[PDB]
Amino acid sequence: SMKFQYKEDHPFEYRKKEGEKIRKKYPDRVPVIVEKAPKARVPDLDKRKYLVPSDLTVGQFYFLIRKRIHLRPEDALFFFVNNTIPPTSATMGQLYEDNHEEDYFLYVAYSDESVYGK
């Protein structure tokens, strides 16, 4: 029951063409949409559409997103993919292949809460 607003701004056919094309142009990268979860009490990131090395781990990706967001040091942040916090040691390539949608994008939500949408 994940709701990514990005899917409302671009038609599916447009997204799928872009996802397939960017994967063909940069096979060592994965395209990722990173969006604040419903109800999250965190700011939005400056950017939503990312291109990520496939061998980067989830923990490294978290480091870089947690660094970029406008939070104080004490503030909490959690990621969700398909309603589930991803494993720190997984690669972004694995996470992408396991979870990308039919448009060839991976969708990651983030929240201050440990359960998506709370």
Partner: peptide, 9 residues
């Protein structure tokens, strides 16, 4: 790639 943001390199 123009509309994408590279992160993690």
């Amino acid at each position: 790639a123009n509309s994408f943001t590279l992160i993690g390199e």
